[PDB]
Design a protein around this nucleic acid. Structure first.
Ligand SMILES: [Mg+2]
Ligand SMILES: [Mg+2]
Ligand SMILES: [Mg+2]
Ligand SMILES: [Mg+2]
Ligand SMILES: [Mg+2]
Ligand SMILES: [Mg+2]
Ligand SMILES: [Mg+2]
Ligand SMILES: [Mg+2]
Ligand SMILES: [Mg+2]
Ligand SMILES: [Mg+2]
Ligand SMILES: [Mg+2]
Ligand SMILES: [Mg+2]
Ligand SMILES: [Mg+2]
Ligand SMILES: [Mg+2]
Ligand SMILES: [Mg+2]
Ligand SMILES: [Mg+2]
Ligand SMILES: [Mg+2]
Ligand SMILES: [Mg+2]
Ligand SMILES: [Mg+2]
Ligand SMILES: [Mg+2]
Ligand SMILES: [Mg+2]
Ligand SMILES: [Mg+2]
Ligand SMILES: [Mg+2]
Ligand SMILES: [Mg+2]
Ligand SMILES: [Mg+2]
Ligand SMILES: [Mg+2]
Ligand SMILES: [Mg+2]
Ligand SMILES: [Mg+2]
Ligand SMILES: [Mg+2]
Ligand SMILES: [Mg+2]
Ligand SMILES: [Mg+2]
Ligand SMILES: [Mg+2]
Ligand SMILES: [Mg+2]
Ligand SMILES: [Mg+2]
Ligand SMILES: [Mg+2]
Ligand SMILES: [Mg+2]
Ligand SMILES: [Zn+2]
Lengths: 144, 81, 129, 155, 87, 150
RNA sequence: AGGGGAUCGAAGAUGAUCAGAUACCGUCGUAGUCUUAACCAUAAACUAUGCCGACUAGGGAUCGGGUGGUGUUUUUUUAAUGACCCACUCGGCACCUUACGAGAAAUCAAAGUCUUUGGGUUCUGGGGGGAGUAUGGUCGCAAGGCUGAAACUUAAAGGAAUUG
RNA sequence: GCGGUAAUUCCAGCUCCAAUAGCGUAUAUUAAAGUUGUUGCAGUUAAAAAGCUCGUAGUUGAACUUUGGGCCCGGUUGGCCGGUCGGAUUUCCAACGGGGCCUUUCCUUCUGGCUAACCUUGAGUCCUUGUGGCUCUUGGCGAACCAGGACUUUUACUUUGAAAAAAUUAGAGUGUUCAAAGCAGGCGUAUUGCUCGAAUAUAUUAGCAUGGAAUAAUAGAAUAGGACG
RNA sequence: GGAUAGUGGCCUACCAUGGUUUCAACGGGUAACGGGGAAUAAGGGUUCGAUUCCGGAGAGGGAGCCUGAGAAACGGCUACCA
């Protein structure tokens, strides 16, 4: 019958053995340890606001080749140092150092996007006005 | 094969089969009534001694044990039932 | 060691039917074995059997036809709550129009439909289609 | 458990409001009292015969049995006048649709009107809070010993 | 496999090996249909009248086509002895 | 089957269908019973008795001509031994094996067999112990078994 | 820690070979190799295949045991023996041929009787690297054994078979 | 995976698609997932059988103990009729179940209270040549449960039921103009009121209550300290 | 015995050595109030519930209490820490 006790009272052995073997399940593992809440630059939440440190030009991974315009952000609620991205053409212009971005995940559950080495976040807003709108001239950056 | 009698099989193929693989199991050993004309009386003996059977009065012998059946001793006669 | 007498029985039958034959020698025959075969017969998935008596546990010689696909046992005789019967049938019966789940109730060893009529429940022994 | 002594305490032991008049020349010295508990557990003869007191006895004491009536198979008698039973059962987990062996140990009070050893099945019944943990009291021994004298020497 | 009222619906009620009584289905192109003709008074084979048998591919493969034939035919007359229902 | 070995040979007697009989067998319950008790008194195992009465004597199944297992006969005549026979022979063996180990500390295989034997001895002990035949306190020990058999 | 230390021989020293040659080949040869008293507890410790039981298909070999015989050969006076021959039956180590059947396949009388999915039971696995690492705990005289994570990274690693 | 000079991926213009007062994105989660596997996985080589054997806990564990036969009672569907002024019930019929008996057959047990039922029968007979049919007290049923005494081997499963909040949910009724909802509303003499409602289902593990007696346990008589009187 | 509205190691006194545990005690973690419930729709499951109803806990942290039928109350008082 291969392994599993088929008995009518082996219920314990079964519940227990399941638990024990769920511990090899990756999402179970992270959801119980609290890896979300311990590690991870974000608190475990969908976004997080922060401040620009330096503007970066990341050498793209292979077999591609470019220079991938980013920003080192220090998370406001956390002080954690996060290197994150400014998508679409231009956009790296809208930033400028010391600015106050709003950061989001890249949609990989951690884990980099494409040829961008080490980047797990992209920028959503700056100065409280969002890339999109700025990029498409729908809004205009605030004063100071 | 494919169709055959399980219930009533030939007492010929049953013959050669193992004592427990017969359609109902029973022994295959037997008894014999043994005589060595030195004395007057005959003694029952089991086909497989183990115990090297000695006679009723005279310290003679009768059969020595082996793997299987007893080798009956020397000049004896017998009868199966 | 020999665990479910029923199981060796059933398995012997199916292995025979698969292998084409018409008769099986099953060992070693319990009351429950009989009742199972009595139901199978009663619904004509086998023919006639015979409880040969050695002075032990017995043997049975089953004469079977060919109209039987699988007959089988459920290893941990699970309890069934009069509504979960429907569920079992659903799980292991090829359709809604034949093949019986056979079980053990307080009012006897019977097929799921007979049990359905008599309206009694208990544990589950197996199935035949 | 008690055994012997009866008057073995710093306090005098006696039944409450059961005056025995010394002016009157009795034949039984101590006038006793008792009842039957109910539901059909005969107030055994050892209770009426005996000399003990224990105001926690269900037959000679002033504690009424009511509520759950449970059985259980005694596993501890090392506590004076009280014991621990292990009531067992099978618990049904739905996911696996099966059972697992479970058990709990209830501490019950036991009047000396029952002699008990470990093994004996017992039938106890709920009374008021008797101790910190004793919520039950012994009412019938559905056993005897389990053949200890049929474990004797040799021929 | 009729239906609600009378009407025998669903085409093709297949053969059936009168050997195992399992179904001989289309792509059993290993099956067999044996025609044994009805003889009559002194030789003479009578075309156009057969006692016929079916033999599933399974059986023929297993080799049991022969022995089960012997039995099948005999119990329907055209063999005397040869085959023994016991061994 | 065959617990401690990985042996698997089947090797039992085949007991006859005829639960009574032999019909050709003469004598009496008296006869064989008397035989049993005497041999018992010669200090024999119920098995030694069964065999000795199988071969020389014409006793096919002592339990048949007398509806009583040999051992039960001996008990019902006060001849019942302190402990069952199988356990005796297990223990006896164990003791001898032990002796061989003490004489020969360089022998591993013996350590093994001793463990095995002993463990049969204990399982079995627990059995008998459970069915009244041995006191719920009975235990096997090396020191004491030494004397227990001899 | 004693004994022993012929043999081959980690280390080390060498003669050469190489561009180099801390090696392959040759020489010398320490520990070792063997044994007693005590630890260590790991191997591709391999059938890379848990244990008990049931059922399902053919073939000749062979080990053990047993049965069956007006079988062969051993001569002596026939036996008795032993060896051998043949049939059969338990239980062994394997091979063969098939394959109803199984599988990703190579192949497999189990790796079969599984979507027609339940005989009993122990254990292990849940992409790849990180890493058998870090840490604690425990065992050891040590070398180390057992227990044994995560952060991070990453879209393939991987197996069998085909064609080149 | 596109971009290193004619880019089906970028930046746009054109045109076209998808969803449309909505649509994108991040994070979490559930389905896909038979990648957590009780149902339902996998372990020769792809991830995975401890070097080996013993062994306690734990899970598991052969077969066998009232089976078969006979009679009685009355239910619910379905057929062939319908008698009737869409439904009806008798006789004919199968079929599927519920109950009680006699077979060597405790039903815990006495002591009255009770009787509903016939071995009764006391008359005879409505009426089809009569066991079709019930009213009917005087010898003769226990068990139907009263309540009092005396005692009771332990369990698992299963049945039915009691006890059981509403809101949620499944669901019935009702035309909030639809619908989400709401538990309203609908009839006239709309001049002095008529009136349907506000259902049912689930409610599981435990506990109580009740039928069952298969399957699986448990206890009993071997130094007879046995069983009935 | 004392205490309480009242049972009870609730407390005191004497007396004893007991109670729980591989059927997982005890300890640790909970980004944990418990339920009625929610989401996901073959089924079996998996995830969630702070949050309109029920129950419970608190009023910056604790402790103490007056009044009263009823509170260890905080839109009551007293003390300490903040
Ligand atoms: Mg792991
Ligand atoms: Mg930097
Ligand atoms: Mg004490
Ligand atoms: Mg065997
Ligand atoms: Mg074993
Ligand atoms: Mg043997
Ligand atoms: Mg060197
Ligand atoms: Mg070197
Ligand atoms: Mg290893
Ligand atoms: Mg073979
Ligand atoms: Mg020979
Ligand atoms: Mg095959
Ligand atoms: Mg198939
Ligand atoms: Mg790539
Ligand atoms: Mg272009
Ligand atoms: Mg474009
Ligand atoms: Mg299930
Ligand atoms: Mg399924
Ligand atoms: Mg998988
Ligand atoms: Mg591997
Ligand atoms: Mg171990
Ligand atoms: Mg059994
Ligand atoms: Mg009936
Ligand atoms: Mg108090
Ligand atoms: Mg204690
Ligand atoms: Mg909290
Ligand atoms: Mg919660
Ligand atoms: Mg809540
Ligand atoms: Mg909170
Ligand atoms: Mg709120
Ligand atoms: Mg409060
Ligand atoms: Mg505050
Ligand atoms: Mg306050
Ligand atoms: Mg306030
Ligand atoms: Mg307030
Ligand atoms: Mg301070
Ligand atoms: Zn003689």
């Amino acid at each position: 019958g291969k392994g599993k006790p088929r008995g009518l009272n082996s219920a314990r052995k079964l519940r227990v053995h399941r638990r024990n073997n769920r511990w090899a399940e990756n999402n179970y593992k992270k959801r119980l340890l609290g890896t979300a809440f311990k590690s991870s630059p974000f608190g475990g939440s969908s976004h997080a606001k922060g401040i620009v440190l330096e503007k970066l030009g990341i050498e793209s991974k292979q077999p591609n080749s470019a220079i991938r315009k980013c920003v080192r952000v220090q998370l406001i609620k956390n002080g954690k140092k996060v290197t994150a991205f400014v998508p679409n053409d231009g956009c790296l212009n809208f930033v400028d150092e010391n600015d106050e971005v709003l950061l989001a995940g890249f949609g990989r559950k951690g884990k980099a996007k494409g040829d961008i080495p080490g980047v797990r976040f992209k920028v959503v807003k700056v100065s409280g006005v969002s890339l999109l709108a700025l990029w498409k001239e729908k809004k205009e950056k605030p004063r100071s | 094969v494919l169709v055959q009698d399980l219930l009533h099989p030939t007492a010929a193929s049953e013959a050669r089969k193992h004592k427990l693989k017969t359609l109902v199991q029973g022994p295959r050993s037997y008894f014999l009534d043994v005589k060595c004309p030195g004395c007057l009386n005959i003694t029952t003996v089991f086909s497989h001694a183990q115990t090297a059977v000695t006679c009723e009065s005279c310290s003679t012998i009768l059969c020595t044990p082996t793997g299987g059946k007893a080798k009956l001793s020397e000049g004896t006669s017998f009868r199966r039932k | 060691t020999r665990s479910s007498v029923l199981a060796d029985a059933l398995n012997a039958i199916n292995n025979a039917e698969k292998t084409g034959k018409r008769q099986v020698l099953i060992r070693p025959s319990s009351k429950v074995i009989i009742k199972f075969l009595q139901v199978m017969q009663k619904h004509g998935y086998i023919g006639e059997f015979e409880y040969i008596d050695d002075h032990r546990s017995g043997k049975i010689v089953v004469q079977l036809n060919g109209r039987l696909n699988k007959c089988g046992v459920i290893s941990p005789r699970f309890n069934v709550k009069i509504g979960d019967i429907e569920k079992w049938t659903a799980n292991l019966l090829p359709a809604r129009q034949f093949g019986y789940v056979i079980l053990t109730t307080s009012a006897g060893i019977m097929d799921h439909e007979e049990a359905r009529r008599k309206h009694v429940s208990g544990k589950i022994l197996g199935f035949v289609y | 458990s008690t055994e012997l002594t009866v008057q073995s305490e710093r306090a005098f032991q006696k039944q409450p409001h059961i005056f025995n008049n010394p002016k009157v020349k009795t034949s039984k010295r101590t006038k006793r009292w008792y009842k039957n508990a109910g539901l059909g557990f005969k107030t055994p003869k050892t209770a009426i015969e005996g000399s003990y007191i224990d105001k926690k006895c269900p037959f000679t004491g002033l504690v009424s049995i009511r509520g759950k009536i449970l059985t259980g198979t005694v596993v501890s008698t090392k506590m004076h006048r009280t014991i621990v039973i292990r009531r067992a059962y099978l618990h049904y987990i739905p996911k696996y649709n099966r059972y697992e062996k479970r058990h709990k140990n209830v501490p019950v009070h036991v009047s000396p009107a029952f002699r008990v050893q470990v093994g004996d099945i017992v039938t106890v019944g709920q009374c008021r809070p008797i101790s910190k943990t004793v919520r039950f009291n012994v009412v019938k021994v559905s056993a005897a010993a389990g053949x200890x004298x049929x474990x004797x020497x040799x021929x | 496999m009729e239906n609600d009222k009378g009407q025998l619906v669903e085409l093709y009620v297949p053969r059936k090996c009168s050997a195992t009584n399992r179904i001989i289905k289309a792509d059993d192109h290993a099956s067999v249909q044996i025609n044994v003709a009805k003889v009559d008074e002194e030789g003479r084979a009578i075309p156009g009248e057969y006692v016929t048998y079916a033999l599933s591919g399974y059986v023929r493969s297993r080799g049991e086509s022969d022995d089960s034939l012997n039995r099948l035919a005999q119990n329907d007359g055209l063999l005397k002895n040869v085959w023994s229902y016991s061994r | 089957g065959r617990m401690h070995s990985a042996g698997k040979g089947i090797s039992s007697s085949a007991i006859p269908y005829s639960r009574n009989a032999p019909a050709w067998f003469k004598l009496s319950s008296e006869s064989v019973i008397e035989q049993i008790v005497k041999y018992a008194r010669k200090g024999l195992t119920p098995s030694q008795i069964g065999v000795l009465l199988r071969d020389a004597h014409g006793v096919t199944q002592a339990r048949v001509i007398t509806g009583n297992k040999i051992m039960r006969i001996l008990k019902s005549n006060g001849l019942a031994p302190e402990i069952p026979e199988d356990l005796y022979y297990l223990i006896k063996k164990a003791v001898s094996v032990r002796k061989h180990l003490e004489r020969n500390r360089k022998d591993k295989d013996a350590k093994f067999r001793l463990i095995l034997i002993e463990s049969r001895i204990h399982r079995l002990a627990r059995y008998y112990r459970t069915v009244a035949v041995l006191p719920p306190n009975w235990k096997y020990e090396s020191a004491t078994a030494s004397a227990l058999v001899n």
